[PDB]
């Protein structure tokens, strides 16, 4: 069992905040079935500062780890293999061991 992978998505807020900002990528994913769509109408105007993209990412892992694996394939479906590798490179092993 790799618990570090769960921390990768939680610590990937600074990477997604600059790369993927609360948009179709984050919305089309949550509405995909991971979390109820009712949360979308809330996040739209619930947050006010950077916390907006901070609660949207935590919500992904806050539900289950299965949604985290889908987001990796959802980005590779178009052309995000660059950033997608960043997450898939820390989920399994770190670097040395």
From Swiss-Prot:
Tissues and organs where the protein is expressed, per its UniProt entry: Ubiquitous. Highest levels of expression in adult spleen and peripheral blood leukocytes, and in fetal brain, kidney and lung. Isoform 1 is expressed in heart, kidney and liver.
Superkingdom of the source species: Eukaryota
Sequence ranges assigned to domain CARD in this UniProt record: 1-90
Induction context: By E2F and p53/TP53 in apoptotic neurons. Translation is inhibited by HNRPA1, which binds to the IRES of APAF1 mRNAs.
Compartment(s) where it occurs, according to its Swiss-Prot or TrEMBL record: Cytoplasm
Domain notes: The CARD domain mediates interaction with APIP. The monomeric form is autoinhibited in a closed conformation through a bound ADP at the nucleotide binding site. Exchange of ADP for ATP and binding of cytochrome c trigger a large conformational change where the first WD repeat region swings out, allowing the NB-ARC domain to rotate and expose the contact areas for oligomerization.
Note: Physiological concentrations of calcium ions negatively affect the assembly of apoptosome by inhibiting nucleotide exchange in the monomeric form.
Function (record text): Oligomeric Apaf-1 mediates the cytochrome c-dependent autocatalytic activation of pro-caspase-9 (Apaf-3), leading to the activation of caspase-3 and apoptosis. This activation requires ATP. Isoform 6 is less effective in inducing apoptosis.
Subunit: Monomer. Oligomerizes to a heptameric ring, known as the apoptosome, upon binding of cytochrome c and dATP. Oligomeric Apaf-1 and pro-caspase-9 bind to each other via their respective NH2-terminal CARD domains and consecutively mature caspase-9 is released from the complex. Pro-caspase-3 is recruited into the Apaf-1-pro-caspase-9 complex via interaction with pro-caspase-9. Interacts with APIP. Interacts (via CARD and NACHT domains) with NAIP/BIRC1 (via NACHT domain). Interacts with CIAO2A.
Name the record gives this protein: Apoptotic protease-activating factor 1
UniProt gene name: APAF1
């Amino acid at each position: 069992m790799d618990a570090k992978a769960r921390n990768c998505l939680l610590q990937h807020r600074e990477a997604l905040e600059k790369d993927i900002k609360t948009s179709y990528i984050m919305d089309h994913m949550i509405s995909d079935g991971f979390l109820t769509i009712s949360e979308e109408e809330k996040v739209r105007n619930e947050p006010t500062q950077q916390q907006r993209a901070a609660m949207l990412i935590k919500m992904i892992l806050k539900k289950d780890n299965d949604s985290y694996v889908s987001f990796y394939n959802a980005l590779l479906h178009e052309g995000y293999k660059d950033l997608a590798a960043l997450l898939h490179d820390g989920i399994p092993v770190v670097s040395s061991s």
